[PDB]
């Protein structure tokens, strides 16, 4: 079968929907999300033209086979989608009502900069390839846009589902190319992270600052030490959650941040015991009594900073 | 092959059954459980009639490809089932009455809330397109549903297999689906967490408890930030096991509340210490003896107050 | 093609046999296995009959689309089998004998109690559904089961491979269903469970008993505390090893009660500390010497009696 | 369906092109890339020639199955390529125009030397093999070699893609292969590297030296033992996300140098109380002053030697 | 179609060699290796016989479908290869060349005995089964055997790649079999193991072994303990890179040991703070002198024992 003839010197519009069934997986690691969906096409055949007195039926049924369908594809996958048909319904004039339901694992980057309290933009780009015969653009049926009421993407919450009307229009192997861009709005479930990651960190970072009411180096050294190693667990825990970015995140800088705070405390730790040893307790009492306050006041200050930069 | 041909403006009713034969996987993190059972179908296509005494045969066994089938699929499912059809058989009147066997990954959420002495309801949402010929209802022929007496999920015991017998009826892209809901009602099986993660968690707690029978700072520090690091490693351990919810789960919310006590722990053995320092062991031996009484007081009391709250 | 039709009133028997080529794999977590093997299949079909002298062949050889061939499946599967069809070959009686090169992943569960000196018998479940020309009841031809002597499953011994010749014949959505059971008996290779975790479990456990030995709270402290999170680490470890069990496992029943150990050892040290505070070395002294021999009499004792329980 | 016959003693120039649409992905560990990309093909076949006049059409379009198409395979892929074919055209003269969108995981080897400031060039050969009746060369359409601005491969920058446009012609089991060369060179994103290991590897090391400003044993034990503890988690969190190289890497020696600082720290502290309780405390503290400066310095000059053998 | 007759008695000689074009990977752990390579096939079929003066044609290209080919499998394979015909060609005397490039996960066991300083012999068992027509015996045609000089083997050198050119003949399920054994021989790339496991394990040993040089209990057990959980880190490691085996490994054996050199030293450190406790410093000086050169000079032999037995 070859594509429908042009009256003109017109294009063939191919309007297409997507319909959400299931969403359900986000990999923020591999910046990949699991689509299965409805993919509706419609354009005019008139090849397939009849009239429903001489012809009796007021529609047409047809095997893919049988008819000419446009190869659509998505732009942004790593294995094209598996569908399967479900419904090709031909009107009088020859509109062809294409229906498949489809599965596909799109890759669409992710924005980390302010994880986890993120938003993104994930997208599904559709692109139908010209041929000589004739050139074929892709339009948007509003009507066929859209999500099933159940469709929930674990860990996120679904704003909008809708795509860009206007087909960016291009040549590529000298051939025009029609790619239109749906777009899935959506935004991240922070609440977890709070009391499993930001409370048990900042917990032990305040368990490190009890330092400041001890004159004993030894369980000093223990304190901050300690701590230390169980914030280097939850760097690392984070760290395996996310990809390696060429920017800074907003848990990354906090996370990193708080090395430094550590590294000053056992300073300070070391700073005090030297003066006590060096018969010098009233200079190391000044700085700790400094320290009290100089620690959580910087701490408060330096994420105020944070925030105001990241948000 | 096109669908049926109505008698009056009667839907076709598509009776189904569905009979498990394994389940064995369900997936917490994911929320995702593997089904492979047999899926009936009966419907009545005139077309296919004939008569004992003229035919000879009194049931016609036939190809999938030489009949009219309904597609069926699955709505909540990331790719559609893998089928073999088993047996088509067509009795006298028309009626066809087919049996497959599937293989499905179907995606059902979970409400980790009393995790892990948690039920859930999982689904099978069974879905049939209607045609422009004629309208496609689903039922449940109840003797057709059931499950093998060697069906056990792994960690869990399943109570019930279950169908809402009237089918939800809906538009979707201007045709009508004809939804039907099976339920597998199942209950985790609670015991290995006991052991395993609350008995282990709840003896590193008492034993940051010790600190309070001691004067020795050095000692308390070690305990109760040892214990703190261990809280931490099943902590890490049992947000693993599951999915980031925006709600409290059960042992979430205890895993939590765990982190006041080590504190509120690091505080009193900070102010035990400075008043011996001061030289106030007197209103130091004070706080340390009500410590040893109202900590397994306020833990009993605020676990009283959860299990309240989560049950 | 339809089945072959019966002389009186006899079932089709469907004679079986598998034999393993490999197996290499089982996956605990998963209580699967993977295995490659031979599926010999053999019928009477009296309508492929034919006479040596006039045919000329001895035998004939037929591809699967040109005759009737039964529809056997395994039952304890998620996914079906991958089948390669090797030969089919036809007597002069019409003696059909199929073969077959399939692979599977088996879901046969596995008992626990015991590990790792666990052994299990593993199955493999043969059926066949009856047609409504026939009812088909399957056999075992013992001559065609074994296993290749380069079949060794990793981690593990394989002590037998056989078959309960007499099948479980029963009805399933009113059609006779013939099932047999084809039986591996295996038995794990415990050894390296002895260098890896059960002697270094101990070792720690040891250590922790030089603390009665020491008068030291502040070592005393650091070696039970130290040794408790090793401890943990190996608990952490062999739970990563195996499912969650609705059951005590006897690796999991010495884990549990070392807690236990650990817990009475904290509590020891702090008597002891006490003790030594409040100017009572003499009692102290007396409870110290006496747990030197009941904590190692108490630990033989107690792991005594849970051998005797588990073996 | 043959090959195409030569007019002289001609070999027949399959020209060929890959066009990038998506990269994403690039596992270090398995040395691997997942590539999607168009592939173009270009022959003469003067037995599918025709003209505008008699035949009606300017171009054709043809199935693969109804026209002979040269066997074009990758040398460096585990499992071939999934191929889609998008269109073939057949002009006048029969000049064959061939496109296909294929996706295929690519064995590429990394030189990890200078990790994480590493670049790679990423490969992938083109092949055919000669038939007995015509020799087949591979050639370079410059025009249709490229990539989409939209590809991006994570934690990676894409330098360039191009093709060594001279074929590596040779012999293979008695018949000609012709081989080309498609290029594609990337450069690490190495910033990540430095918040989350680099600097927090310095930081904990940079603690271990504060023992150089303490007299305490005790705590200098716990201070560089605890933080060589967190240089093996760091250690293990490295050689986890690279494979065995029989190279060192430039992490990899900075990480085992690191060691022996570390080694070297515990020896200073040893010696240090050695000679305190030898009631030698001058020399050292001579030995300590001078630990304080040699420390870093010899880091210092250690880390300029490195870089400057590694870059 | 059939299998070719023969002249006398004689069997079918069919031919056979493997060019290896990506060997790339091997896990350790599950004892397998991922093979893609090409497959050559060679036999005679007199029925395929031709003359170059009357058939024009001096070699005729035949489609897998028109001619007979014999069912060549791996014997040791989970999955049979995924293949692809590239070549089929016939000689005047009716000698049927046969070519195809395929991909295969191989079963073949590992000797882990002298792990990571092993090397291994890696299998690939071809097999024919032999028709009821005619008996089927496989050979080598060493021409047709070998590697391109880009296979390399990730974390191993590639030593040969040969076959035992005469057949393993055996009956099976009364039905000659003829497996032929290729040889893929491997020598690890130990290296890496040096500076990641090896020289960090006995680092931490070493620095245990610094309270030889130390009165201080306290500071002795931090010293014994913390290196002995590090210790525990590396067994933990080690043992994730490897299989179960029912042997000790060279590396295993190692770990092991130095279990019990960590045990002795936590005795020493015990009993020399017992002594000083009970006012007998001279009978623990002369222990921990001794201790000094008996650690390391019995770490020195008992290693020498160890590479002795296992090399
Ligand atoms: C260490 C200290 C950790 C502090 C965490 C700060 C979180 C924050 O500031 O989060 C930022 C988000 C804001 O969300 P937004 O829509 O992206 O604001 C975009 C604003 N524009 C469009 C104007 C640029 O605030 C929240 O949701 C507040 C609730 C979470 C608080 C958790 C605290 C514990
Ligand atoms: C730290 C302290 C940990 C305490 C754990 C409390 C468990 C609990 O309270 O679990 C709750 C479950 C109840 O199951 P339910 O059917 O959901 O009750 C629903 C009731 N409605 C329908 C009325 C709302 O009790 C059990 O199965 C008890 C056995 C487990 C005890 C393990 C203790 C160790
Ligand atoms: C902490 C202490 C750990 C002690 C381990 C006890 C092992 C045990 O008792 O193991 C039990 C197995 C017995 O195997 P069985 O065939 O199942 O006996 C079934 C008997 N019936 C049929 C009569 C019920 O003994 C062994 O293989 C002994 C060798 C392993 C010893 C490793 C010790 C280190
Ligand atoms: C412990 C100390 C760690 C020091 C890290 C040194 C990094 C380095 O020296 O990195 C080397 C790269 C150079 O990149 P190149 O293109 O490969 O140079 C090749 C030069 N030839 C072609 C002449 C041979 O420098 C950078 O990108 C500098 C930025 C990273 C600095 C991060 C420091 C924290
Ligand atoms: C703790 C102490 C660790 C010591 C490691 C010993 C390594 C060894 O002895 O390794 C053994 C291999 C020998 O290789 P082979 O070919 O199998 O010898 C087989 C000999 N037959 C055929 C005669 C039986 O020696 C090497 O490659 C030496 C280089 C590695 C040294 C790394 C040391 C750090
Ligand atoms: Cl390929
Ligand atoms: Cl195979
Ligand atoms: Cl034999
Ligand atoms: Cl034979
Ligand atoms: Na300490």
Redesign the interface.
Known sequence: V?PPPPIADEPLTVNT?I?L??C??LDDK??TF?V?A?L?LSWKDRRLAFDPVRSGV??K?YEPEAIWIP?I?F??????R?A?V??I?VSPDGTVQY?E?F?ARV?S?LDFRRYPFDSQTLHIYLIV?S???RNIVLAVDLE?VGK?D?V?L??WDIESFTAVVKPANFA??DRLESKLDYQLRISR?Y???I??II??ML??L??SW?AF???????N???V??????H??????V?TNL??????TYT?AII?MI??F??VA??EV?VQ??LK?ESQPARAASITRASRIAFPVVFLLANIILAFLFF
């Open positions: 070859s929907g319909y069934i299931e359900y997986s591999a910046e699991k299965n409805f509706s007021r529609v049924t190869e594809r732009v942004n996958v790593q294995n094209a598996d399967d479900v419904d319904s229906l339901r599965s890759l980057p390839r041929v000589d015969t066929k099933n159940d929930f674990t860990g590529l192997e479930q609440f977890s992270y009391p499993n409370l048990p917990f032990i305040f368990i009890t009411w001890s004159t004993s180096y030894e369980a050294v223990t304190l030490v300690s701590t230390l190693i169980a280097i667990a939850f760097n690392i825990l760290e990809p390696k970015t060429p920017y800074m990354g990193f090395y430094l550590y590294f056992v300073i070391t015991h030297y040893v």
